[PDB]
Amino acid sequence: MSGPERITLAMTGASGAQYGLRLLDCLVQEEREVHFLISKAAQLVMATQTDVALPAKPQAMQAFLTEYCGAAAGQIRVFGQNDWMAPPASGSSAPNAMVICPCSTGTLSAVATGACNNLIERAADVALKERRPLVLVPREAPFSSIHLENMLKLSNLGAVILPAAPGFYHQPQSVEDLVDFVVARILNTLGIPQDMLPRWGEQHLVS
Amino acid sequence: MSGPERITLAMTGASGAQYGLRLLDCLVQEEREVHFLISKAAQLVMATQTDVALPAKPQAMQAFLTEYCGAAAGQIRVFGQNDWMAPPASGSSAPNAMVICPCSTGTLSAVATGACNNLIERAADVALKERRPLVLVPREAPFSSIHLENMLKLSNLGAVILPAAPGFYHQPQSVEDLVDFVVARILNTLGIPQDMLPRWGEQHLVS
Amino acid sequence: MSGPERITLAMTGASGAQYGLRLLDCLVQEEREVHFLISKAAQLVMATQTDVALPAKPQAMQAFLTEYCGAAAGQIRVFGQNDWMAPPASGSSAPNAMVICPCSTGTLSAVATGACNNLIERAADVALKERRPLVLVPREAPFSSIHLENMLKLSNLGAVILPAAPGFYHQPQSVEDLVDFVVARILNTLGIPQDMLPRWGEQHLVS
Amino acid sequence: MSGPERITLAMTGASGAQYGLRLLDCLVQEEREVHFLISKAAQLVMATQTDVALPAKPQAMQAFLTEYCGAAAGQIRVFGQNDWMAPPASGSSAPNAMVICPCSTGTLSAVATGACNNLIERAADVALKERRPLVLVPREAPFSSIHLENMLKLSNLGAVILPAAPGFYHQPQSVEDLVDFVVARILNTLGIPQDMLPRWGEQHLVS
Amino acid sequence: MSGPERITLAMTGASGAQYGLRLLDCLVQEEREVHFLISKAAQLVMATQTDVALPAKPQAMQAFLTEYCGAAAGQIRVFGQNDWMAPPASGSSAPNAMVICPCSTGTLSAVATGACNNLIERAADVALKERRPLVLVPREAPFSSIHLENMLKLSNLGAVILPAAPGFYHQPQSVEDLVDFVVARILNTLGIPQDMLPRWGEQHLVS
Amino acid sequence: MSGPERITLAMTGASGAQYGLRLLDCLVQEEREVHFLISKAAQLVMATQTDVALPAKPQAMQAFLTEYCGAAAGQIRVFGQNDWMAPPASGSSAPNAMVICPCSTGTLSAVATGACNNLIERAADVALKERRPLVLVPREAPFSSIHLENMLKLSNLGAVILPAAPGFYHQPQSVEDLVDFVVARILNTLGIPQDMLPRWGEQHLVS
Amino acid sequence: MSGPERITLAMTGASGAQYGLRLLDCLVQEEREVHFLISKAAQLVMATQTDVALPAKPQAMQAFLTEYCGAAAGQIRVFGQNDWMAPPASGSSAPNAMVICPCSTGTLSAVATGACNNLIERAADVALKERRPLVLVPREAPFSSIHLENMLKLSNLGAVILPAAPGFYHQPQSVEDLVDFVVARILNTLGIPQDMLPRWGEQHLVS
Amino acid sequence: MSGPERITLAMTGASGAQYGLRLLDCLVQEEREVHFLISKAAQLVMATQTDVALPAKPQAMQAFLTEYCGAAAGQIRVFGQNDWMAPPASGSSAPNAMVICPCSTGTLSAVATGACNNLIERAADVALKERRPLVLVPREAPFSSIHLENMLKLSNLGAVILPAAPGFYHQPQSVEDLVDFVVARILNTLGIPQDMLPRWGEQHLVS
Ligand SMILES: Cc1cc2c(cc1C)N(C[C@H](O)[C@H](O)[C@H](O)COP(=O)(O)O)c1[nH]c(=O)[nH]c(=O)c1N2
Ligand SMILES: Cc1cc2c(cc1C)N(C[C@H](O)[C@H](O)[C@H](O)COP(=O)(O)O)c1[nH]c(=O)[nH]c(=O)c1N2
Ligand SMILES: Cc1cc2c(cc1C)N(C[C@H](O)[C@H](O)[C@H](O)COP(=O)(O)O)c1[nH]c(=O)[nH]c(=O)c1N2
Ligand SMILES: Cc1cc2c(cc1C)N(C[C@H](O)[C@H](O)[C@H](O)COP(=O)(O)O)c1[nH]c(=O)[nH]c(=O)c1N2
Ligand SMILES: Cc1cc2c(cc1C)N(C[C@H](O)[C@H](O)[C@H](O)COP(=O)(O)O)c1[nH]c(=O)[nH]c(=O)c1N2
Ligand SMILES: Cc1cc2c(cc1C)N(C[C@H](O)[C@H](O)[C@H](O)COP(=O)(O)O)c1[nH]c(=O)[nH]c(=O)c1N2
Ligand SMILES: Cc1cc2c(cc1C)N(C[C@H](O)[C@H](O)[C@H](O)COP(=O)(O)O)c1[nH]c(=O)[nH]c(=O)c1N2
Ligand SMILES: Cc1cc2c(cc1C)N(C[C@H](O)[C@H](O)[C@H](O)COP(=O)(O)O)c1[nH]c(=O)[nH]c(=O)c1N2
Ligand SMILES: CC(C)=CCOP(=O)(O)O
Ligand SMILES: CC(C)=CCOP(=O)(O)O
Ligand SMILES: CC(C)=CCOP(=O)(O)O
Ligand SMILES: CC(C)=CCOP(=O)(O)O
Ligand SMILES: CC(C)=CCOP(=O)(O)O
Ligand SMILES: CC(C)=CCOP(=O)(O)O
Ligand SMILES: CC(C)=CCOP(=O)(O)O
Ligand SMILES: CC(C)=CCOP(=O)(O)O
């Protein structure tokens, strides 16, 4: 298999829950193991901008998502915001790639400064110190200079800053087609196969 | 009228022509005067990702857009890429706000470095030296550290970096609803009235 | 196979065309796919400092190089300087390593600043944002502080700055032996097998 | 095999010889090839803080270590401090990962500044220019701002700064258990299998 | 008495509780007054990596520690994480030295950025603004560039960054001997007498 | 006694040996303990610019200086350039103030970069990490930007940069009076009594 | 003649008037034209630390110095502190080298910041903008970080920072011999012949 | 004569001895005086990559080179690595231009940091403080960020960084023709006549 076997997928309180749910579903279909984390604000976003009725507690959540995605048993692990017992809290864990999708400006800040106040922030701190993949998917506009400095710092240290900025070059016809563009970019970044967005120019031999 | 009477709208070669066409139409409906500039790459984008058959030469272009938007005669001015005779080339011109929507990574670079190689780049250089509004709407993912440094420099100097990153908090049902979210943000930035995106929380009196 | 299956090889207007032609030939012999780009200045260099009569237009060029190197059909793709349809223009393309050999001081500048004015510059911009290999082979002396700052910025972001500075530790007897030293270094950087430069010290067991 | 086939292991004059000897032994047991370098100060440390009677000259040293670790013939190569003939002195060598364990503050300084005064420093300079793994294991307290600036510079360039700071979360009962924690972290960094430190949380499915 | 009469000892959630308990005991034996603060994460660390059954609430904690260490009544004060009434919250308090042992990467971050979210962070903020001693004892490996930048900033402002990196030059035979090395370094930094680690070279008169 | 009981006095290869010999004599007369270190270049300076015939080996040197200054037995300790057994090599030593008088540009460099190549450089590295007094007395003209950057870095970290730049405000009549001005400044910096340079203005009550 | 025909010699209020008077005399003997400027504080220094009774007003001063040095009529020009009519105030003047000897910390500050409050400061501002020689001779100890930053800035812009730090390698026997060392260094910097300090090593052919 | 009368030519341990020998020969033919310095590593390079059997000791070396180049007696001075008696060690020496050809990455480092550990490094330190020409000829590939930062610092201070990167625009037919290109560039930098590389375009009057 190309790409990581295990992804830590953290969802934080930016207005783009569709992208994290779609990514979760694609990752499950590519038979990856997902360690799923979600912030309190992200739970309010999902409740108010989607049709998904996500249970509050980690075990009910894990059961719900396993159904929602058609996952295998234990394929999706759910950990709460102070569960330091969970793999992502330590660099001695097995290697996984981490994606924060969507990534709020507050979570971006915490990761840039090293705040480690909850499991998502500590997980990203560990990805950085271990040189493990870390992809942040901000959804904000305008970006202020505070946001941009935090993104630059992290980019300079090897994180991938992948804004939720879909392109129109595959002729999108629906909101779902724009959500899939962003998701396809994330999977490409992670090195995981995808067939939602063709490889640009692959059939063009000469100019 | 709130907001600027005249906007310089430059469209450059990022995959988001829908946003610049929609903005052009909203600006016309709010009876603003638009000085419209478009790059060669942006013409290829529009030809390949939209249904809009935009003529190549500035006078045919001006006639086409005036029809497309329902504008009044002389409401939309079109200037070519080396027309130094046009108002945006000089700080002695009448004040206008400038928006680059969409803004390619190459145009972002040129504006950050001061390259002034064509009328769009010189127009942005003049907006900066005159302290006139300058809004850039990048559409790229990932953003590299080169992109992020160029955005930060410009943000620090007072430009507004407004990525084409729509939110989902107004329940979008179509691609058009996502395009209008971004457009609504731009008009808000410019101080121009809009009724596509409600004022968040305006009716909430207490927590 | 070790190393990348596909290399984007861009030749720009520094006085070292021999190195890019030799690299092209080595890449073909290692059965890699080459996406070949060449600047207008690089065409003048090749015309004046080599015996290679390279045709001007991309399809005639592709036929010429395919012969010159003994390549298989479609092994070498040639794209012109504004062919945005070509794979290297987008990060959604299939992954390839990019080498700019030789790299003029102007191309170094454009890549460091993000100028994206033609397909070579945009290709390098995409390599950077995608975290794909990017090797620059400058040929200039002295290096000014402008050159050195541009190289440092790019090195800091993970590009490899590999100056056309051959060593003499394999006893070179000809101009070709110096050209092959530099080429051997490039292939090593890319992780592609080569037998022009032995592995230093591989038989030395103790001091 | 996961991880590098060949490791350059340099031991320098910080008070932690136990960690470099233990790492050497683990690397031998995982059937890796080790290019072993040791500074004059590190020889005084080993003589005074361990029970290991290490011979002075490279060939006697190689014989001693080969016995001490149970290595195969030629599995451990020993090179002296000015043996420029040895593989680590040149980037044209075969790829290996380099670890400096322990890393004195003086060696940290030399690597950060590019001093290349002996084979260890030149070896690290080459690892950096080749983008090959470089792990530094400092043992000092307090760390001054000079130390911290030197570490930051190197971290920013992709070196791994792994201080000899063992954790207590695997219930250590002996000095050997603390030495093995640090060694286990190094092997994890290098991507080499180890069974001294379990994978944190690997059996935890839900919070 | 040499050294401070009063120490604020904060324990945060890094895997090194042994060092803070040992320091607490040494400080009590040198008849100092200790203002003891402990984070929620540090309570989970102590519960899981030590044999010490520390009560949760500040008054039960104070009674427990007073027994554990043989302290005099009122020698150890315990304050909770939001007790702004406590001396360390204000610069108008009586002078004391502050040690954060162990110091998590999150607490390091908060102190470097000025976050003041709880009493430990505010206490360190006050130590800095008052020019009072502040010693941080991180326990992490690798250190990332985020950690290293946060340490450098604080070192530059006069904090002492004293990693939990014991040396082996006093022939340690047990885990306790390594814990005491680090503790001895802290007491030396604070100017408090200790007889666990001899004064290096004190009897050496000539080379 | 005011000021430190023990001073590490290092003499390095700048053209000002008179100042270090005079300081050594003043320190002995104020009954301080001096740990004396001298570089190979400083030995050549003393041989060629003074009348002092200093023996080469540390024990003969210690006997010579003890006579030259009228010191008590064991008041002056002499350590060689690789004597890591000596107190100044470790921060676990008893506290002393360190003066490098004169300080060559090479020694200034090594201290600024953390090179630790010999006992003087390591001693200064330890003074810095321990927050112990460190006074550097450069003697060079012009100062280049390399020198000035190295001095600034060290000044910013709390070292005292005290150039061998005597003043004329005490009416000097001899070379000895200029040497004593500089020495008086050093003793003032260290907080040690001196009566060579009066306290400026001490008898002036009103303007 | 080697070196400049005209020198602007400014004397400011550091305790080293001997050096500026000696330089003035050497410049006169080498038949240079001197534009002489002196600050109010420098007049108090000269009155209190030398035997030279310098008149207050520019014309009496010019007559006095012309006698003191044996100069030709009009060889020494004296200008007051607000005489903007004088050549050094404008870059349109004839080229001259400028030396500030001695240079107070206040004058160093003004030159580094561009303060131009009097003719000396404006003269130095003009030397810098014209790329004309500018030599500053500070006399201060310790140098603080403010002093060192001001010196570095100016050194980086091409000024020569030449501290009043005499060497002892020409066997000085008097205060005058130390004053002449510094003066000899200044003349060397300016490219003016001098025979007070031999050319180091000029007769040494082999090592 | 145009250009300097005296050149300090230092050869250090990069793989390009041919360039320093050829430069030495050209300098002798232009009747310049050469102060020749060579490092221990450079002696190993010359022994292994050239046919030149250079004696070890300075006087035998001077005799050998005087023969090899056809020099006049005393035209080439040879100084050893610790011969502080030699002119280049002091700024009070007669002015000469300094070239380090080839310049190892270690020597580049030492010059950038001010290390002054041997006569070559001190000579370069003096060139910088005296504002005398300093040309460095590195031979390394890739250049890391450490190398590039060291080059930039020195370039910014006025050193010339002239990499051993020959061009092909004079139709080179041999290894000697590439060596002469680099040498011709160095002589041009120094302002010394050369007829190996024509003046580009000198006969071109119009475009
Ligand atoms: C409905 C709704 C929508 C948004 C938000 C909030 C809510 C309630 N917030 C804000 C954000 O959630 C807030 O600053 C949190 O403190 C983020 O905390 P976490 O990073 O999720 O722990 C938010 N933040 C942001 O960066 N981009 C966005 O698009 C949104 N949209
Ligand atoms: C179809 C198509 C689509 C895109 C592009 C090109 C084409 C042809 N380009 C690239 C870009 O247009 C190129 O780097 C130009 O050089 C930009 O020039 P202007 O800034 O418009 O003058 C591009 N650039 C970018 O920053 N974001 C994008 O989404 C796209 N999409
Ligand atoms: C014959 C010849 C030789 C050279 C050049 C030009 C020509 C015509 N140029 C200059 C360079 O080509 C010019 O600055 C271009 O603008 C570079 O454009 P590209 O980067 O190729 O698009 C050039 N540039 C450089 O960096 N190093 C070199 O060795 C040369 N040699
Ligand atoms: C017994 C003993 C113990 C130590 C040391 C020395 C000796 C002799 N040194 C110092 C160090 O070895 C010295 O600065 C050397 O110059 C380092 O040279 P290398 O980097 O090994 O070539 C030392 N240095 C350090 O960074 N951390 C340490 O723990 C120690 N411990
Ligand atoms: C068992 C255990 C062990 C550790 C941790 C946690 C737990 C539960 N954490 C993490 C840390 O406690 C987390 O990022 C907290 O958010 C830190 O909060 P405080 O700074 O104590 O408020 C942790 N953090 C760190 O910097 N170094 C370490 O050694 C450890 N070890
Ligand atoms: C006679 C004599 C005089 C001087 C020197 C040398 C000699 C031999 N050196 C140079 C210096 O000693 C050289 O760069 C050494 O490498 C410094 O090494 P240490 O720092 O003493 O180990 C020298 N260096 C300096 O910074 N200022 C000076 O005044 C002198 N004077
Ligand atoms: C007797 C005497 C001696 C000194 C001073 C003053 C006096 C009165 N001052 C101080 C200085 O003159 C003061 O800060 C002035 O404001 C400098 O002004 P000018 O730069 O000359 O205009 C002084 N300043 C300094 O930088 N180094 C010194 O050696 C002295 N010595
Ligand atoms: C045969 C051979 C070849 C090279 C080297 C060595 C040897 C032995 N070294 C390395 C270098 O010489 C080493 O880092 C020295 O420590 C440099 O010391 P000096 O700067 O000459 O004192 C080397 N260094 C470099 O920067 N570029 C190179 O091309 C080479 N080539
Ligand atoms: C939760 C936990 C064991 C954190 C310690 O992990 P690491 O040693 O800092 O990578
Ligand atoms: C096209 C033109 C008149 C440019 C000059 O404008 P400005 O004085 O630079 O603002
Ligand atoms: C030519 C083209 C489709 C450019 C867009 O690519 P990407 O989304 O910016 O990587
Ligand atoms: C010892 C030696 C051949 C050094 C040259 O290696 P590289 O070309 O600098 O990687
Ligand atoms: C809890 C309290 C009184 C904080 C104010 O202290 P300070 O004036 O900020 O030192
Ligand atoms: C020579 C020696 C014991 C060095 C270790 O000292 P420290 O622990 O780094 O202060
Ligand atoms: C006193 C005077 C004419 C100042 C103007 O000089 P410049 O044009 O600023 O060089
Ligand atoms: C070898 C020697 C006399 C060094 C002193 O030279 P300089 O005064 O630092 O230029």
PDB file of C-alpha atoms in Angstrom, chain A residues 88-189:
ATOM      1  CA  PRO A  88      -1.005  10.279  19.488  1.00  0.00           C
ATOM      2  CA  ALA A  89       0.048  11.697  22.822  1.00  0.00           C
ATOM      3  CA  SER A  90       3.566  10.173  22.655  1.00  0.00           C
ATOM      4  CA  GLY A  91       6.307  10.007  20.170  1.00  0.00           C
ATOM      5  CA  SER A  92       6.881   6.413  21.257  1.00  0.00           C
ATOM      6  CA  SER A  93       3.673   5.486  19.509  1.00  0.00           C
ATOM      7  CA  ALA A  94       3.517   3.710  16.166  1.00  0.00           C
ATOM      8  CA  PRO A  95       4.062   6.185  13.252  1.00  0.00           C
ATOM      9  CA  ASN A  96       1.005   7.765  11.721  1.00  0.00           C
ATOM     10  CA  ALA A  97       0.310  10.835   9.498  1.00  0.00           C
ATOM     11  CA  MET A  98      -1.785  13.538  11.106  1.00  0.00           C
ATOM     12  CA  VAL A  99      -4.358  15.746   9.374  1.00  0.00           C
ATOM     13  CA  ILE A 100      -6.275  18.576  11.095  1.00  0.00           C
ATOM     14  CA  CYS A 101      -9.277  19.052   8.820  1.00  0.00           C
ATOM     15  CA  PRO A 102     -10.736  21.561   9.253  1.00  0.00           C
ATOM     16  CA  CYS A 103      -8.154  23.475  11.299  1.00  0.00           C
ATOM     17  CA  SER A 104      -9.476  26.481  13.210  1.00  0.00           C
ATOM     18  CA  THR A 105      -7.337  29.601  13.623  1.00  0.00           C
ATOM     19  CA  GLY A 106      -7.102  28.724  17.326  1.00  0.00           C
ATOM     20  CA  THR A 107      -5.762  25.258  16.662  1.00  0.00           C
ATOM     21  CA  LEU A 108      -3.340  26.667  14.083  1.00  0.00           C
ATOM     22  CA  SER A 109      -2.117  29.064  16.792  1.00  0.00           C
ATOM     23  CA  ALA A 110      -1.689  26.337  19.395  1.00  0.00           C
ATOM     24  CA  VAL A 111       0.284  24.128  17.020  1.00  0.00           C
ATOM     25  CA  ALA A 112       2.535  27.008  15.941  1.00  0.00           C
ATOM     26  CA  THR A 113       3.265  28.031  19.576  1.00  0.00           C
ATOM     27  CA  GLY A 114       3.467  24.481  21.037  1.00  0.00           C
ATOM     28  CA  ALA A 115       0.539  25.000  23.501  1.00  0.00           C
ATOM     29  CA  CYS A 116      -0.380  21.279  23.848  1.00  0.00           C
ATOM     30  CA  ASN A 117      -3.650  22.043  25.865  1.00  0.00           C
ATOM     31  CA  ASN A 118      -5.576  19.020  24.652  1.00  0.00           C
ATOM     32  CA  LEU A 119      -4.943  15.820  22.734  1.00  0.00           C
ATOM     33  CA  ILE A 120      -5.201  17.392  19.258  1.00  0.00           C
ATOM     34  CA  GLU A 121      -2.603  20.015  20.076  1.00  0.00           C
ATOM     35  CA  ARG A 122      -0.264  17.550  21.785  1.00  0.00           C
ATOM     36  CA  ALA A 123      -0.702  15.103  18.865  1.00  0.00           C
ATOM     37  CA  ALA A 124       0.445  17.806  16.417  1.00  0.00           C
ATOM     38  CA  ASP A 125       3.372  18.723  18.736  1.00  0.00           C
ATOM     39  CA  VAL A 126       4.423  15.088  18.639  1.00  0.00           C
ATOM     40  CA  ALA A 127       4.092  14.837  14.831  1.00  0.00           C
ATOM     41  CA  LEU A 128       6.453  17.789  14.560  1.00  0.00           C
ATOM     42  CA  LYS A 129       9.052  16.498  16.982  1.00  0.00           C
ATOM     43  CA  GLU A 130       8.977  13.065  15.316  1.00  0.00           C
ATOM     44  CA  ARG A 131       9.150  14.443  11.742  1.00  0.00           C
ATOM     45  CA  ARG A 132       5.867  12.655  10.964  1.00  0.00           C
ATOM     46  CA  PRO A 133       3.448  14.079   8.367  1.00  0.00           C
ATOM     47  CA  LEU A 134       1.318  16.936   9.576  1.00  0.00           C
ATOM     48  CA  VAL A 135      -1.325  18.516   7.283  1.00  0.00           C
ATOM     49  CA  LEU A 136      -3.389  21.510   8.412  1.00  0.00           C
ATOM     50  CA  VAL A 137      -6.531  22.517   6.491  1.00  0.00           C
ATOM     51  CA  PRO A 138      -7.478  26.070   7.565  1.00  0.00           C
ATOM     52  CA  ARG A 139     -10.851  27.589   6.598  1.00  0.00           C
ATOM     53  CA  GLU A 140     -10.832  31.330   7.297  1.00  0.00           C
ATOM     54  CA  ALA A 141     -11.054  34.543   5.283  1.00  0.00           C
ATOM     55  CA  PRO A 142      -9.454  37.061   5.404  1.00  0.00           C
ATOM     56  CA  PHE A 143      -6.303  35.542   6.802  1.00  0.00           C
ATOM     57  CA  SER A 144      -4.716  38.070   9.164  1.00  0.00           C
ATOM     58  CA  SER A 145      -0.983  38.516   9.683  1.00  0.00           C
ATOM     59  CA  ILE A 146      -1.301  36.477  12.901  1.00  0.00           C
ATOM     60  CA  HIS A 147      -2.740  33.574  10.912  1.00  0.00           C
ATOM     61  CA  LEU A 148      -0.179  33.960   8.161  1.00  0.00           C
ATOM     62  CA  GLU A 149       2.829  34.070  10.530  1.00  0.00           C
ATOM     63  CA  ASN A 150       1.559  30.910  12.303  1.00  0.00           C
ATOM     64  CA  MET A 151       1.156  29.153   8.920  1.00  0.00           C
ATOM     65  CA  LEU A 152       4.593  30.236   7.701  1.00  0.00           C
ATOM     66  CA  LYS A 153       6.326  29.060  10.874  1.00  0.00           C
ATOM     67  CA  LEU A 154       4.715  25.640  10.496  1.00  0.00           C
ATOM     68  CA  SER A 155       5.354  25.398   6.753  1.00  0.00           C
ATOM     69  CA  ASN A 156       8.988  26.247   7.379  1.00  0.00           C
ATOM     70  CA  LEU A 157       9.157  23.301   9.808  1.00  0.00           C
ATOM     71  CA  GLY A 158       7.692  20.920   7.276  1.00  0.00           C
ATOM     72  CA  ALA A 159       3.961  20.942   7.992  1.00  0.00           C
ATOM     73  CA  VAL A 160       1.711  21.188   4.959  1.00  0.00           C
ATOM     74  CA  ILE A 161      -0.645  24.147   4.979  1.00  0.00           C
ATOM     75  CA  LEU A 162      -3.518  23.116   2.677  1.00  0.00           C
ATOM     76  CA  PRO A 163      -6.278  25.678   2.782  1.00  0.00           C
ATOM     77  CA  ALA A 164      -9.882  24.656   2.049  1.00  0.00           C
ATOM     78  CA  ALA A 165      -9.650  26.485  -1.284  1.00  0.00           C
ATOM     79  CA  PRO A 166     -11.121  24.294  -4.013  1.00  0.00           C
ATOM     80  CA  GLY A 167     -10.254  24.745  -7.680  1.00  0.00           C
ATOM     81  CA  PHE A 168     -12.641  24.698 -10.615  1.00  0.00           C
ATOM     82  CA  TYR A 169     -10.480  22.979 -13.197  1.00  0.00           C
ATOM     83  CA  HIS A 170     -12.338  19.621 -12.991  1.00  0.00           C
ATOM     84  CA  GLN A 171     -15.756  21.331 -13.851  1.00  0.00           C
ATOM     85  CA  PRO A 172     -17.472  20.982 -10.510  1.00  0.00           C
ATOM     86  CA  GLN A 173     -21.281  20.702 -10.603  1.00  0.00           C
ATOM     87  CA  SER A 174     -22.090  20.400  -6.967  1.00  0.00           C
ATOM     88  CA  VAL A 175     -20.969  21.316  -3.418  1.00  0.00           C
ATOM     89  CA  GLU A 176     -19.880  17.710  -3.163  1.00  0.00           C
ATOM     90  CA  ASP A 177     -17.567  18.056  -6.133  1.00  0.00           C
ATOM     91  CA  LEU A 178     -15.848  21.059  -4.392  1.00  0.00           C
ATOM     92  CA  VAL A 179     -15.538  19.084  -1.139  1.00  0.00           C
ATOM     93  CA  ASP A 180     -14.018  16.213  -3.051  1.00  0.00           C
ATOM     94  CA  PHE A 181     -11.433  18.463  -4.746  1.00  0.00           C
ATOM     95  CA  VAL A 182     -10.029  19.465  -1.336  1.00  0.00           C
ATOM     96  CA  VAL A 183     -10.170  15.909  -0.081  1.00  0.00           C
ATOM     97  CA  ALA A 184      -8.363  14.655  -3.202  1.00  0.00           C
ATOM     98  CA  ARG A 185      -5.586  17.207  -2.534  1.00  0.00           C
ATOM     99  CA  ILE A 186      -5.194  15.953   1.006  1.00  0.00           C
ATOM    100  CA  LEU A 187      -4.929  12.346  -0.085  1.00  0.00           C
ATOM    101  CA  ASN A 188      -2.398  13.252  -2.714  1.00  0.00           C
ATOM    102  CA  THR A 189      -0.356  15.061   0.005  1.00  0.00           C
TER     103      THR A 189
END
